[PDB]
Each structure stands twice: as C-alpha cells, then as structure tokens.
C-alpha cells in the first residue's frame, strides 16, 4: 500500500525511530537497527605463495674422470663441476686417483610439502557487493530483514516489502590487489606471476595450490666444497614467504578506517561505519487504520517524575489520557532532541501511559504524539 522512504546513518548497534504518516490514516512508529553490513568483493586468484624447497640430491663425485653439467628444465636449476677435488670418507679417500677427480653439484627449487597447509593467496579485488541485516520493531515484534544494499533487491517479511540501499558511499577498505593469509587480509601491490624477486614476497609463485609447475627466482648459487669433504654448499636468498610472515605488520582488521571488521572464507568487510543507508518499506493497506476506525485522544496531560540526560533512556514520562475506544496507538517524539523507547502502546479509556525517553538537554521541552493527538512534556534532566 503506502511506501515509507527514510535514510539512516551506516552505523551498527544504534536503534533509529521513524514516523510513518499516511494521509487520512493513524501514524505508525518503526524502530530500525542495523545488525551487520557486509561488503564482499569479487575475487580473482592470480597465484599462491609459500615456503620454497631447495632439492639437493647426492653430488656426483666422478673419480678419475670429468663430470659434465646438463641443461635441465627445472625451476632455479643450478649445476657446477668442481675440479681438483680429493674427497675423504670414513675409511680413507673415496677416489683412487690423486689428480683428475671431479664433483658435480646439482640443485633446483620446487614447492615445499608445507604449501598445502602454510600459504598466502594473491587476489584481484573488484566491485564489492553490499548486503545488510536489519532489525525492525514491526507490530510489537522484532523482525529480521537480510537484503543486498543495492536498491534493487525486494525482501518481504510479514507482508512488508523492504528495499535496502543503494549505499551513499562506495568506499571499501580493500584495494585492487589484496593478499590473504588464513584469517588475515593485507592491502598489497604484489608482483605479477613470473616477476617475483628473491628474498621477497613472490620468490616462488604457484597459480593454484595443486599446480605441478611453479615459478622460482631465489638467487641459488652453488659453492665449491671444502677440502676432502663430501657436501653441497650453496648461497641463496632466504624464503620470501617466511620473511613476509614476520614483516607483514598489522592486518586490515587492525588498520582499516571507519572501524571495519575483516573476516575470511569468503573475504569481507563487516560493520564499516561510512556514509548513510536509504531504507524503503512498502507497508500494506490492511496494516493502517482510518481516523473514524482508530481511537480518538482527548484531555491529555504530561508529567516527568524522573530525568537524567545521558546516551541511554534516563528519562521517565507519565501521560494521562481519555480515549473514545480500545485499540493500539503509536508513540513518537515530535522533537529531534528527545527519543522515546516504546513505539506502540495499548489504549483503553480513562487510563494513563508510562514512556521511557533519551535526551542530552538539561531543560527538555518536547511534544509526544499518541495516535493522532499531541501532548507537551516539560522535563528538568540532571
């Protein structure tokens, strides 16, 4: 029937009061509270990174001969033949010859066994999908509405059609390029695949965690073995992933502005206090009551026995009334400086009602609308 359009700030855990005024019908008060606001960006996995493994097999010690290095199609493949080597084992010299003996040192880089368990993912973040969970005090009961904050997603709860958004701010704590490690998200302009530097994030790059082929750039250089010693000494830049793990600093959960809460699986921005949120509620005709059909309010008076000016409902007000008939009446403050806790009260006849109110003013002058009649309240808050 009647469509009520209102705008509330994008702040979670704050109840807001809205007055629905349909011409020729009794006013309606609705309490709205944002339970959660989720910003889930669309992800495109470029690659994953982890600790690398330097595979070093047994060195080929060619006694009385010269070993030869072959070009192998392996990541960071290094081969070097060392001349004039006379290696010693437990029971003396390994080679019969004193002279012409050579050692072939072999090494290559591949994915570590840890890569399936310990890894960081490089994602391309673009166009965030906004969604909201809203609590509505509708007909004396709390209703939960979960809808996309785009302004083109109608969700109907208790015959009332809800259209949330579009968001005033298109702001996201995530940049175009993001890095994800377990429960932590980082804004990082990561190097592209096949462009990773040694000792830095991306020294080893794998398109998927199950991938057989990997990119490697670790500055692996094989060194000459010690006199009479069988071993493969080498110089290599330490793990870029291991270095990043200690040098990454605080994640987006701790650094993001507007008090953003960051969650993973899927990656999302929760409760980012930025901008406002328009809310459209299509209330059906049957929910509204005509002035002839609704109770009439006369001989009204208001008294404030106790008041404290604070963030919570520190004020108490007693409103005496004379009603023509029994029925439900909406309670709303006509002054923006004062907010009333209850939205609806059951009217009887020659009885009185008690309301709870919140204000910041020491001298609170406010008007209370019970059904279609207004009553002035004078309050001295401490």
């Amino acid at each position: 029937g009647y469509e009520h359009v209102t705008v509330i700030p994008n702040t979670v855990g704050v109840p807001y009061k809205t007055l629905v005024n349909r011409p020729g019908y009794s006013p309606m008060v609705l309490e709205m509270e944002l339970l959660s606001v989720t910003l889930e960006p669309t992800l495109s996995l470029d690659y994953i990174t982890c600790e690398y493994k330097t595979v070093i097999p047994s060195p080929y010690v060619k006694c009385c001969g010269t070993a030869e290095c072959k070009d192998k199609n392996l990541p960071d493949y290094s081969c070097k033949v060392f001349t004039g080597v006379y290696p010693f084992m437990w029971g003396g010299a390994y080679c019969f010859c004193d002279a012409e003996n050579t050692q072939l040192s072999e090494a290559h880089v591949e994915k570590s066994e840890s890569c399936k368990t310990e890894f960081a993912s490089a994602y391309r973040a673009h166009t965030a999908s906004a969604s909201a969970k809203l609590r509505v005090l509708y007909q004396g009961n709390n209703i939960t509405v979960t809808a996309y904050a785009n302004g083109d997603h109608a969700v109907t709860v208790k015959d009332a059609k809800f259209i949330v958004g579009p968001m005033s701010s298109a702001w996201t704590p995530f940049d175009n390029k993001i890095v994800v490690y377990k429960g932590d998200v980082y804004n990082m302009d990561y190097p592209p695949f096949g462009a990773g530097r040694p000792g830095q994030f991306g020294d080893i790059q794998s398109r998927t965690p199950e991938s057989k082929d990997v990119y490697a750039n670790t500055q692996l250089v094989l060194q000459r073995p010690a006199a009479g010693t069988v071993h493969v000494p080498y110089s290599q830049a330490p793990s870029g992933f291991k270095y990043w793990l200690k040098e990454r600093g605080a994640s987006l959960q701790h650094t993001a502005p507007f008090g953003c809460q960051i969650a993973t699986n899927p990656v999302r921005a929760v409760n980012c206090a930025v901008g406002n949120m328009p809310i459209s509620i299509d209330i059906p005709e049957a929910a509204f009551t005509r002035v002839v059909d609704a109770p009439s309010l006369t001989d009204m008076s208001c008294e404030v026995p106790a008041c404290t000016h604070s963030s919570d409902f520190g004020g108490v007000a007693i409103i005496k009334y004379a009603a023509s008939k029994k029925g439900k009446c909406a309670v709303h403050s006509m002054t923006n400086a004062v907010t009333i806790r209850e939205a609806e009260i059951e009217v009887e006849g020659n009885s009185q009602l008690q309301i709870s109110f919140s204000t910041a003013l020491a001298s609170a002058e406010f008007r209370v609308q019970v059904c279609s009649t207004q009553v002035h309240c004078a309050a001295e808050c401490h």
Partner: protein, 338 residues
Amino acid sequence: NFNVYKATRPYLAHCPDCGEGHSCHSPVALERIRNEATDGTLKIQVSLQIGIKTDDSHDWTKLRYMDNHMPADAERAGLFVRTSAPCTITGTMGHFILARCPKGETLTVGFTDSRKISHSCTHPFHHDPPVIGREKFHSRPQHGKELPCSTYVQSTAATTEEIEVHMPPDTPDRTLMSQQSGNVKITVNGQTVRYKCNCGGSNEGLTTTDKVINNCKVDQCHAAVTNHKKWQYNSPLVPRNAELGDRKGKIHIPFPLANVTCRVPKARNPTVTYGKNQVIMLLYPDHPTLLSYRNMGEEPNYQEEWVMHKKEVVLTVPTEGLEVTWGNNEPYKYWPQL
C-alpha cells in the same frame, strides 16, 4: 606386516660440528630442519633411524645407527635435541624427530652408543618461533580462545609426504688389504669389494671372492665395499653411486604438516575509568600482552605496544569512536556521551 625399514638403513654423513667445532663423519648427521609449523614445532631429519632395531623389528625403546661399517643398536633414552638449552621431543620415527625448542642460533641432535661415546651434530640454525595470538605465554592452557595454527602430527602412519632413496656408494676400507708377504692380499669377507691397484696384471673389479696382487705395495692399492642390497636417503652429504645412472626410489615419511587448533589464554579485563573525551585503563598482565588501538573514523591512526608489567594507559576517545584490543580478548569499543 609391511616394513619399509627392511630395504632402508642408517648411515654416516658429513657434519660441520661433531663437538668443539671439529668436522666428522657423523652417525647422527643433520640433513634438513623444517620450521613451517606456526605452533613452533620443528621437523628434524637425521642420518640414523629411531624406533627400529638392526633386525628391522619395530621397538620404540631402541635406535639404530651406522657403527663404522655395519648398523648397531642404541637406546632411545640417550637421544637428545638442544638449541641454546635442551628441547622437548614430541615424536620419533625413522630419520625424523619432532621437537619444541627455545630461542637459539644453533641446533644439536645427539645420542649415546653401546660403549657410551656421545655422538652429536651441531648446525647453525636461527630458531625464534613467532607468537600465536596476541599474548607471549609460557605454559599452554586447557581452556582458551581457539586460534588456527599448524603442526606436524604425532601419528606414526606414513602418508602424503615423501623422501628420495637410492643404493649407497662404495664405502672405502683400508682394513680389507694386507701384505703376504710383500704383496697385496684382499680379503672379501662375504662382501662385494671394488679394488684398484697401481700395478700390472689384475687391478679391476668388483669381486665376490678373495684376490691376491703379487709384486705390489699396500699404499699403491685402493679398496671399497659395494652394497647394492640396501637403500639410503638421497643425501647431499653422501656421494652418488658411480656405477648406476639416475636410479632413484621413494618412501613415505611420518609426521606431515596439517592445520590444527592452538589454545590461547585471554588476559583479565582491566579496571576501566572514564573522563572527558578520554579512557583510563589499569593494565595488570601476567605475561607480555599486546595492546592495540584505533579511531573509528577517516583517520584511524593505528598504535601498538607490548605491555610487560603494571601500566596505566590514558587514551583519547574521539566523537567517531575508539576501538581497543587487549591481548587475545575481543575488541572493546568506546564512544563519548552526546
């Protein structure tokens, strides 16, 4: 009743420090130290085999190491792991050891043999595991916050992870050669021996029988025992077999890495006092606790400090709001009164 240790054997490999900074052919030589586990657990690979006897039978109280030419039995009790101070061994099977170590710059793995003689191997290894959560605690609690962490599972079973194995190289041994009377006598002793002499006639093989080299000196000859019947880890500290080409084998290994849960304690909530656009907290930590804070507006201005002992903190609460995180506890949110 399948046993992979029938084929494999413990071995002697190069170690840079066997004690007092001197290099040796160690029966407890260090191959690879893995530190991928976020919980601080180290997966250490050694040249000997734990939990297996010389007859291949599985016995948790026993250890097998290469004694000169043939493997020998040693006690599991005598096995030790240390960095700057002794480590806590969490699991042992074959060439692998699981240990929880304190902060150090070196890693030592040792044992005691049959006739005492302590054998150890020291390698330079920077060990300083990162903190799990936001509190630097000493002992692990029963109850606490469940945070994701990785470890090497204590399970005996060998699946997923693997190592490369191959036949061992020719082991040189000068005791195989003797002089009879002024010639060279090579005693095979029921083994396949490869010999080379700087004399004429016969100087080749690869012999399964005893051989004699007339008119030759003991210094002019070289003898080595070939194995071919056993397997050994593809170690970069042991030479490759010259006779065979790129012949390789592979075996499954115990203790693979997997995601688990680490219990972390939550620091007690500080006594909170409020003021005009500011919050005052009296912090009482039992151990080092991370204290972090940020503004809930356009300029968050993130600040962090590790609280060691009793400290009073005065924080300014802006109109936009202030978020404070005290250790492993959920973040506290503060707003000024309108």
